[PDB]
Amino acid sequence: YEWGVRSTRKSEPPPLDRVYEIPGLEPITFAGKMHFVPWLARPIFPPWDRGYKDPRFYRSPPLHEHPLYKDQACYIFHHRCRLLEGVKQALWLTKTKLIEGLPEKVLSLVDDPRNHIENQDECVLNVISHARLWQTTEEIPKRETYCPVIVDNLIQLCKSQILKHPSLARRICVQNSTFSATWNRESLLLQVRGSGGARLSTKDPLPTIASREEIEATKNHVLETFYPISPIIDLHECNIYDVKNDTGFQEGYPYPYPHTLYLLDKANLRPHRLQPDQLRAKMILFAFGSALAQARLLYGNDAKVLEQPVVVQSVGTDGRVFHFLVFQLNTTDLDCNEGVKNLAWVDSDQLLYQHFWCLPVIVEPVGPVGFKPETFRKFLALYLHGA
Amino acid sequence: MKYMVYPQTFALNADRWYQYFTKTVFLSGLPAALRAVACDCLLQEHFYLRRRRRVHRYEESEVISLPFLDQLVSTLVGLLSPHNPALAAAALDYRCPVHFYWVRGEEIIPRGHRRGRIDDLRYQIDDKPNNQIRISKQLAEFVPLDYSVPIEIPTIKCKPDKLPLFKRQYENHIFVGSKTADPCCYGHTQFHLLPDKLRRERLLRQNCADQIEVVFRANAIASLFAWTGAQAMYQGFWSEADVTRPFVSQAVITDGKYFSFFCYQLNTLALTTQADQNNPRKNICWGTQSKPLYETIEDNDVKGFNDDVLLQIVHFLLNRPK
Amino acid sequence: ANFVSWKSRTKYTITPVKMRKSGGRDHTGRIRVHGIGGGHKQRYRMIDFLRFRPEETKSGPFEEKVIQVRYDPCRSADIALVAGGSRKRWIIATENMQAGDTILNSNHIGRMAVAAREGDAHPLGALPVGTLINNVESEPGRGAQYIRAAGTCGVLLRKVNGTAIIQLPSKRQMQVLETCVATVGRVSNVDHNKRVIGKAGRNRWLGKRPNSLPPMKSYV
Amino acid sequence: ARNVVYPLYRLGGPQLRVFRTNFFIQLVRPGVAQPEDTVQFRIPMEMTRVDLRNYLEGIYNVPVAAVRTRVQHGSNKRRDHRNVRIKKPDYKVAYVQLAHG
Amino acid sequence: GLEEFFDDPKNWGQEKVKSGAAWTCQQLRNKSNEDLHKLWYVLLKERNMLLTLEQEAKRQRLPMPSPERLDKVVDSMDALDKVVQEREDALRLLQTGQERARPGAWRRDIFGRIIWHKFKQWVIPWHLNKRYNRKRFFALPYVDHFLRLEREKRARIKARKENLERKKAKILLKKF
Amino acid sequence: GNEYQPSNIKRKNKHGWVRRLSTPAGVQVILRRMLKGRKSLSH
Amino acid sequence: LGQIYANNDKLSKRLKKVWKPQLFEREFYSEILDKKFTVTVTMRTLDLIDEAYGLDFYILKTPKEDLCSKFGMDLKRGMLLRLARQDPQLHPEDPERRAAIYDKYKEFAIPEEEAEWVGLTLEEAIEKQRLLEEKDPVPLFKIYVAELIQQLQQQALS
Amino acid sequence: ADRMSKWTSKRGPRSFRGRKGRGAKGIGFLTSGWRFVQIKEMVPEFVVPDLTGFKLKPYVSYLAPESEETPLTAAQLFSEAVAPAIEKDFKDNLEKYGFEPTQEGKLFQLYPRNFLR
RNA sequence: CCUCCGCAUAAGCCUGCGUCAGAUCACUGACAAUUAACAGCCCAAUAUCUACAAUCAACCAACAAGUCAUUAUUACCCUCACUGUCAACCCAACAGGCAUGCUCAUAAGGAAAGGUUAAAAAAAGUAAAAGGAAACAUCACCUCUAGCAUCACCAGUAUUAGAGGCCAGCUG
RNA sequence: GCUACCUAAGAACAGAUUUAUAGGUAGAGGCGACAAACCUA
RNA sequence: GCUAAACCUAGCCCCAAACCCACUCCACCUUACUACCAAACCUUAGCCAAACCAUUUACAUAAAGUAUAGGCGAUA
Ligand SMILES: [Mg+2]
Ligand SMILES: [Mg+2]
Ligand SMILES: [Mg+2]
Ligand SMILES: [Mg+2]
Ligand SMILES: [Mg+2]
Ligand SMILES: [Mg+2]
Ligand SMILES: [Mg+2]
């Protein structure tokens, strides 16, 4: 069953005038006139090409004359790719073992009560109430309006602790920074083209989390392979690509080392947003991508097991559900299914409030409900990492 | 329906007109590692960040200069939080609307079924600063309330529609950047950047090279009156209950490369003809000329990096409520 | 008239397609079918009725996974988003098909019968005779034209050399070739028949206005 | 110029140049109160804002800074003895703000 | 400056200004092309002067000081433009032999009549110009009847005019 | 009597020169207006 | 296109009838053009081809009015220009076959100045004559140079 | 409902009033976001001479004589422009004398025109 | 004293209570105006992507199943033009109608009475003793037809599609 | 451009709703919760 | 004695003779009057007459309203 009916297809030209069949004679057409005439023959025009070049009427060459048409298909992962099997597929493409819960090295930063902004419930209540209610002139702010403002204001609350820690004066957050990283995985080449908001750069790299006992203990782990799903579903099969490793930056850049990828889901529609398992998969591929490009910038394109492993953490959100991720990239020999594996610590479904009421009901007042500040304790644990 | 005062305005000599609409005296003047972080932001946006899509010239100040100014404010509010703890608890709104609606004057309707009737001429400013800093407490005033100053406000000789100023009817908004339930109603500082139309390259190409600095000055008066005035409305004051204390805010506005600095001291919400009879009091806008932050940027670093411009940014960010 | 049919997309797409009501009208704007028009809006999910299609640079039988068993407005049965290899596609659901179920689309005609599960698709030479089938082709490579509505089923009656004979739910028997693919089991959404519309609102919401044995057929 | 076919510009082509200007211009007095630096003209219909800027710059050496035009509808409401509408012709009005103070 | 829209400030209100003749054509055929360029701008600025003076004359409800020199300046712009077009045309006849500066063709629209079609500039050639090919430069056979009807309406108007001229001639011979 | 409920899109799309010339019968409408002598052949 | 009386008496309803011929997609081989054409044809045309002893004779013998097809007249102009030129493009590298085919139809030799105009409709001949006598006009520089060198050669002979 | 009135740009709905304009010429083109790009080359430059020391006023004195109208035919312009060069080079390749066969290499082509006025 | 009106945009109309002048219950001529930021006027190809409604979107709650999205490579550097902008207004009638946003009695808009008398009859309103009436469609059901694909039915497939039938009380 | 049904993409206050805009169906016709109603008095 | 009355001459009609028109510049089939981008032919039917209607029914001179045709009738 073919798609597209004949009435919507390009209508075939009527068959040629029978004069074009007689071999001896030149037809007499309306091409001597400069207009259609129905009692002369329809001429056959040579395929015209505009000699000069104009940009608004450019017609690019077909997909062989492009100077990088590699026949071996690269599967690309851009920020819009909504994966199918959720986290398992990114764990396969990443060659990593998952560990539920953040490590004690990160959560112990907020173990003492000294690492606290004063009245953190009042401040985070004001960030939630500001962005989700008090923000704009509209009566309720839409998600595209408030979600970067929730993330941005929480980063300003954690940025207000330069008074307690001077080291946070060595980190910036850049935006519209696009990294890229290609790696081989069993049979076919993969690329992540990373274009997400708020890569928080530092001067200093993050100190590693997993010891060599745990990295070595990843060898007996096996990746849970899956089926019928070939594990490249919903990536973008591109033939016209370029293998390239980009940290997003020119060389010689202060604040060069990625710290946290603050990637968010600010689409107003439920179908237009990433489902939260796919959100977590997008975080694993972006932190893997930027950490991997950091490894290619520090160590060449050498498939090896890294001695100074790179650790890049990321926070992804829908606006009220937070998903935390610490990624520990310790091998670049991705193509085998054995050896040491990367390892990642996740926090799933860490909502910082159940719901927000932007109008009073008649009973329940204006404001959030279900607020739980342990999630901001996790957020602020991730901001204080390496300080 | 009301006049629609645009702060970042193409109109010639719109500064003198806005001092009429606003009842302001424009007084010229004012009442280390920061250089490293500033040059890090400059070189970050011009040089170090790799662009996927090619930055054309029209696309520039949307792509290039806007996150430059965002990064400057977020890093200076970062680093200057120990020197000024009021910025540690101060809200930082990025591209957030400020509206103010006031009534200034009277007009008898010249044509129509309403002819010969007093219709007071309303105005609204809708503005988006690039980013503003709002404190829960209020900066102390620069000059005393009801400070006399001998220079006189302009008086236009014609209808404000003879400046290209146009009328619409839409929702009258008085808005500081957030609704009135927010605890941070008062305002510290406000950072603007002039749009692609108001480049000084065009203003030199067109023969209005005089009005270049006027553009800065107009964005001074319309924005800050719409901000301080809106702050005065959130504290309950209005045109008949005039402000009992002066409301003060502050603005560095720029072209991306040239910076100018402004202070604004709202003393009167009494702008109507009913309320400008026993009203000697007036609003005062302090201002500087424009000075370039850097001079050029080549391949690797900046050249001709001025330092007093960073010191006036910092001295704006460093004052405090009491 | 300006009738351009919406039935115009060329490539198969997993996404819903905005479709345009005809109103009962022709391409000439006159009512040919009375009593159509004015329903709730619907989007069209493109169904792949060629059930066995090997994908690009693959062949032979292949497994596929059910991701979601989805209501479809355009038809009576509900459908299944079903992904295998590098491609998702919408197929039509059988009665017990869960999310997460695995379904084998097979091509090899065995020597013996294949004790197939509830929702898989086999050539009619590979089935135990006297089983309920659905989504039956008419040529090898035609695509599944019949036994397609909600809860319907037809039983494979008997087969001759290179030929199977089906009982359609109107009990008219059909002679098709052996190597035409049909899916086993009965179509989902049973008790679509046992239902009370209750008010005429649901008659109007489905796009409906008010108004004004045969011989065993062959295809060999 | 007006009532002249313009040559088509293709990207990379020469500058379009007018050597004898077809369209005239007349500066009228403002019928309302206007600012001191605004000079009001009656542009003919086809003259754009940019043509007027270069027209006053080239021919009259006037430092023009802003130009704002309005098209004025002349009335088609006055009739002959024949009950046939006479149209007073429509005209474009240029409002010119002069530079340099 | 803007004072070139106004004449000599001594002439303001004098209600009569001595102006010379207009340029005739043969006086202008002796001038070079650079000189006709410069004279075009002399007459151009003078014409803007006189048009401001007309519009202010209608504004103040007064009559013009001398409306004749507007007729003289339009007279000279017409003669000068005609001279410049003569030299363009004679050079066109020598260099190419054409007679029209703009190309065209005798075509025959939907309405049957033969029209000089003036060509327009386009970028793409005519056979893939989507809007050009919606124009019909052929008349179908249901038009030839209306061509005959139009032909006979013109022949009636001509016959009426010729006959009416002869009747006026007979009245002249009866009167004289 | 408020049968005429005006719009310019329906007026030009109903009776304009382009719809009149789109058909042969409408071209004959134009030709009869041109032959009666009329000042407006269409909208 | 006519009418019948309903049962072959004039005292019944006069009701109208169209008599359509019987059409047949057949296929022919013109030896002069040397090509197989797929032509819709009727039984009477096949019979006239048989009575003319070939489609080349059927086309070169039948009068333009009698033949009454634009396509058959274009076949006639093709064959007649092929015979009017004695074309080597009939059978290249076989000159005996060319001369045998060309001598078989020697009867219908028409000059080339007449064989172009065979079967053109009047508007198509208006076009062909329009393209014959279209010329870029002569730039009057060349005409005036010719007259002036003529005049200086009259002064040279004085 | 008017037919006699001219269809001007002031007259339709918003979509009609925006499209139709007066007789002005396009200077550039619209781009995405409805952003008009102005092309510098399509704007006419008024080539305006220097009037300094120029001795021709707009009127002619009445003391000047009357002459006879002799329009410039191509025979005259050939005679004075070309004829001395051909008489000189004939008493002692027509492109030598100021003739060009084509003018596709030429900036100011005479047929069809590329200059304005 | 009314205000169930207003003010704007839309559509429509096309200078239609601006100034000067004049003729006429007591329009003509001249001149002048509506200034773009609002709104129209857009988009470089070729491929390839777009399963998870909206409802304060959170649970719940569903069915009639829903209004919103890119990436890959190539090309790409100039820039703010054009048009709308007025009014007491439109379609009718010689009563009515009109989309939307705000205001929900008005900050905006207006005037039911030319003067008199206070007859009849008529219209409307208020008061009144005592009395207190003196067929089609369609859920559902049945029947018949129809084994099928690229312009309806239908991008549907017999659980489908189509055609049929069905007292007391008050009151001029 | 009314009116009847339809379509596209909307809106409003709860639908077998009301409605603006643009398109479609044309007289041997259309359209009809069929009044042999309506289809510019 | 008000209202009015009057008025000749615009033009037109019928012949004859003769074969007409149609690019100042610009714009004009897109929503005509807008500077500029990827397909034509296919019997006229009926009114009316026949006192209805149903086949039928007109579209130089002279032969001649003759031969003919025709519900052998109206009529042609
Ligand atoms: Mg305008
Ligand atoms: Mg705009
Ligand atoms: Mg208005
Ligand atoms: Mg009022
Ligand atoms: Mg009265
Ligand atoms: Mg009573
Ligand atoms: Mg009869």
Side-chain angles (χ1 to χ4, degrees), chain C residues 12-13 54 58 67 87 92 94 99 112 125 162 171 184 189 196 201 206:
Chain C
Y12 180 73
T13 317
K58 296 295 292 296
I67 310 301
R87 64 105 182 274
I92 182 163
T94 70
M112 288 71 72
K171 295 183 282 186
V184 311
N189 196 5
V196 175
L206 296 173

Side-chain angles (χ1 to χ4, degrees), chain D residues 6-17:
Chain D
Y6 282 12
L8 196 58
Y9 171 72
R10 281 178 165 178
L11 195 275
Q15 178 68 40
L16 190 269
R17 296 177 187 271

Side-chain angles (χ1 to χ4, degrees), chain D residues 5-10 18-32 39 41-42 55-56 59-62 98, chain E residues 1-2 4-6 36-37 40-41 44-49 51-52 55-56 59-60 77 80-81 84-85 102 121-124:
Chain D
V5 45
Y6 282 12
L8 196 58
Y9 171 72
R10 281 178 165 178
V18 168
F19 288 9
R20 290 182 293 120
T21 308
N22 201 0
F23 38 71
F24 61 91
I25 189 179
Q26 60 190 357
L27 85 91
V28 306
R29 182 177 293 174
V32 296
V39 183
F41 293 91
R42 284 184 185 175
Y55 188 90
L56 290 166
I59 299 174
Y60 284 105
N61 286 314
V62 176
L98 264 65
Chain E
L2 288 171
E4 298 191 359
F5 285 91
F6 302 106
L36 291 177
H37 181 71
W40 183 263
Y41 282 95
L44 189 277
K45 292 186 286 186
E46 172 66 15
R47 189 171 177 177
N48 296 326
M49 189 275 285
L51 288 168
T52 60
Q55 191 58 244
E56 189 64 26
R59 180 69 176 270
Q60 301 290 319
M77 294 275 276
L80 197 155
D81 189 76
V84 175
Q85 290 181 2
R102 183 179 178 182
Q121 300 165 356
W122 303 89
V123 169
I124 56 166

Side-chain angles (χ1 to χ4, degrees), chain A residues 321-383:
Chain A
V321 176
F322 275 82
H323 296 289
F324 302 105
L325 185 272
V326 185
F327 187 75
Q328 208 277 334
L329 190 279
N330 51 14
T331 180
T332 65
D333 183 77
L334 273 310
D335 55 352
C336 180
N337 207 355
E338 299 296 327
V340 302
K341 297 172 185 182
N342 305 323
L343 61 158
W345 295 267
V346 295
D347 278 335
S348 177
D349 297 328
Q350 297 292 317
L351 44 83
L352 85 165
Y353 54 93
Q354 178 69 41
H355 176 63
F356 197 90
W357 289 108
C358 291
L359 274 305
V361 75
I362 305 96
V363 179
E364 292 296 326
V366 179
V369 59
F371 176 72
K372 45 174 68 67
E374 189 174 358
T375 62
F376 180 71
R377 183 182 303 274
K378 295 176 181 180
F379 189 90
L380 185 270
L382 294 178
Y383 194 82

Side-chain angles (χ1 to χ4, degrees), chain E:
Chain E
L2 288 171
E3 297 293 328
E4 298 191 359
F5 285 91
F6 302 106
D7 48 352
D8 199 357
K10 293 179 287 185
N11 294 128
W12 290 354
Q14 287 180 358
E15 290 294 326
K16 191 179 294 295
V17 176
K18 287 184 181 180
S19 66
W23 291 91
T24 185
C25 298
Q26 189 63 42
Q27 290 180 358
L28 288 178
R29 290 183 178 98
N30 292 321
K31 300 294 182 289
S32 177
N33 290 321
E34 306 170 1
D35 200 353
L36 291 177
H37 181 71
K38 296 179 182 179
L39 186 57
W40 183 263
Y41 282 95
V42 173
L43 291 169
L44 189 277
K45 292 186 286 186
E46 172 66 15
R47 189 171 177 177
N48 296 326
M49 189 275 285
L50 292 174
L51 288 168
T52 60
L53 206 145
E54 286 191 357
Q55 191 58 244
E56 189 64 26
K58 296 175 183 180
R59 180 69 176 270
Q60 301 290 319
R61 305 283 184 83
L62 291 175
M64 283 285 279
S66 68
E68 297 178 353
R69 51 183 175 168
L70 195 274
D71 312 341
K72 293 177 179 183
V73 169
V74 177
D75 191 83
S76 305
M77 294 275 276
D78 289 336
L80 197 155
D81 189 76
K82 189 170 74 66
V83 166
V84 175
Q85 290 181 2
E86 284 183 355
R87 294 176 187 173
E88 299 291 328
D89 285 332
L91 189 62
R92 189 183 306 122
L93 283 166
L94 286 168
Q95 296 292 322
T96 51
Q98 301 298 121
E99 292 171 351
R100 279 84 54 194
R102 183 179 178 182
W106 292 96
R107 286 178 185 174
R108 181 182 174 85
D109 54 349
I110 316 170
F111 299 139
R113 65 183 63 94
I114 291 170
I115 294 173
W116 178 253
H117 184 69
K118 300 180 189 176
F119 288 166
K120 300 171 76 173
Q121 300 165 356
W122 303 89
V123 169
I124 56 166
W126 64 266
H127 55 274
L128 41 89
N129 202 160
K130 194 173 179 181
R131 198 176 73 199
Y132 177 76
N133 286 107
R134 292 200 297 264
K135 290 193 287 184
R136 277 93 73 195
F137 301 103
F138 57 94
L140 293 183
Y142 54 82
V143 166
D144 205 354
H145 178 64
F146 289 100
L147 291 180
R148 193 256 181 96
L149 292 174
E150 287 290 339
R151 196 197 195 284
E152 295 173 351
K153 184 180 177 184
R154 295 175 302 185
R156 287 187 183 98
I157 298 165
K158 180 181 178 180
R160 283 200 287 264
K161 184 181 71 179
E162 289 175 348
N163 187 14
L164 191 275
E165 289 174 351
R166 294 189 181 99
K167 299 291 178 184
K168 304 292 181 176
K170 295 297 181 187
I171 296 169
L172 286 172
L173 293 181
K174 292 177 185 177
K175 191 79 180 298
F176 298 99

Side-chain angles (χ1 to χ4, degrees), chain A residues 188-208:
Chain A
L188 49 59
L189 184 56
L190 298 168
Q191 184 169 3
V192 286
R193 287 186 186 266
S195 176
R199 170 253 176 89
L200 200 148
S201 290
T202 64
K203 290 192 177 74
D204 302 332
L206 289 177
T208 71

